Design a protein around this ligand. Structure first.
Ligand code: O19
Length: 288
């Protein structure tokens, strides 16, 4: 059931749009009926040949993944009479963990936060087994299936390690989520499981802020660097702050033991950052 016909793939709702991609909720009814299944469809926006090649790689990555905490691949639609490509995924009703945390604060306490943490770690452990580097871990990129299950959604930025190295060097990017980046990613464009672990620390910070507006990583880092500055000088200041131990603060209400996990992920010493496997084991112990 891996190939979906464009004639039966009906638009329902916008789910998230960027400069280079869009995801929509759609209904797939091939028995032309109503019983058809609801899916999520990712398509490029402002597509180029190079972006299409990248998208094919992103599709093959998601298809290669089978895990409870990773959005389920369903197939591809070769749309415009088989002259274009769209990616078909399962549909997750509850949106992004960022939006969910903000809307449903009153049924989320600390143990629930840590249940999400743990599930994120486990998806990340699984990604590690395929030598994939996510490069974009953020609560906006984590999806909520139900109150008991979250899933890493979006592999737009994901790279596969060379078979002979432990790091991937990106030259290209331009625009990047700099406030979630490890310092060597900012300085050297080097990406690794260790840099994913750094980003994971920032995700843990996001959770314990419960998405209160002025507590976001960009809001905080810009407070710290000076919310006056503009263009490159922002990145200059961020690198300098990080290299010399400026860090996000402990959120209000966050236990020491949980902030400590964050600060250990935020190690400038790449080789001393914890593994996703020891993070899962730690978090699971704090949860009991
Ligand atoms: O948005 C992105 N990626 C993305 C990846 C996967 C999904 C996805 C895959 C499966 N289910 C859902 N569910 C979902 C349900 C509701 C909502 N919302 C959106 C607005 O408010 C209602 C809840 C968002 C996602 N979303 C959504 C977006 C990336 C690519 C374009 C820009 N940034």
């Amino acid at each position: 059931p891996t190939q979906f016909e464009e004639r039966h793939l009906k638009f329902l709702q916008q789910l998230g749009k960027g400069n280079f991609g869009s995801v929509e909720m759609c209904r797939y009814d091939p028995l032309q009926d109503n019983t058809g299944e609801v899916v999520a469809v990712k398509k490029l926006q402002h597509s180029t040949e190079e972006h299409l090649r990248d998208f094919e790689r992103e599709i093959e990555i998601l298809k290669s993944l089978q895990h409870d905490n990773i959005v389920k691949y369903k197939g591809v639609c070769y749309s415009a009479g088989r002259r274009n490509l769209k990616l078909i995924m399962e549909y997750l009703p509850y949106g992004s963990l960022r939006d969910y945390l903000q809307k449903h604060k009153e049924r989320i306490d600390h143990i629930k936060l840590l249940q999400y943490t743990s599930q994120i770690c486990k998806g990340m452990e699984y990604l590690g087994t395929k030598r994939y580097i996510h490069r974009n871990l953020a609560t906006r990129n984590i999806l909520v299936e139900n109150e008991n299950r979250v899933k890493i959604g979006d592999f737009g930025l994901t790279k596969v390690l060379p078979q002979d190295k432990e790091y991937y060097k990106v030259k290209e990017p331009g625009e990047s989520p700099i406030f979630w980046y490890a310092p060597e990613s900012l300085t050297e464009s080097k990406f690794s499981v260790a840099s994913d672990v750094w980003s994971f620390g920032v995700v843990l910070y996001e959770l314990f802020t419960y998405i209160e507006k002025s507590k976001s990583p960009p809001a905080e880092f810009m407070r710290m660097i000076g919310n006056d500055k503009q263009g490159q000088m922002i990145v200059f200041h961020l690198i300098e702050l990080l290299k010399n131990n400026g860090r996000l603060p402990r959120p209000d209400g966050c236990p020491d033991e949980i902030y400590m996990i964050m600060t250990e992920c935020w190690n400038n010493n790449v080789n001393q950052r914890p593994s996703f496997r020891d993070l899962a084991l730690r978090v699971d112990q704090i949860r009991d």
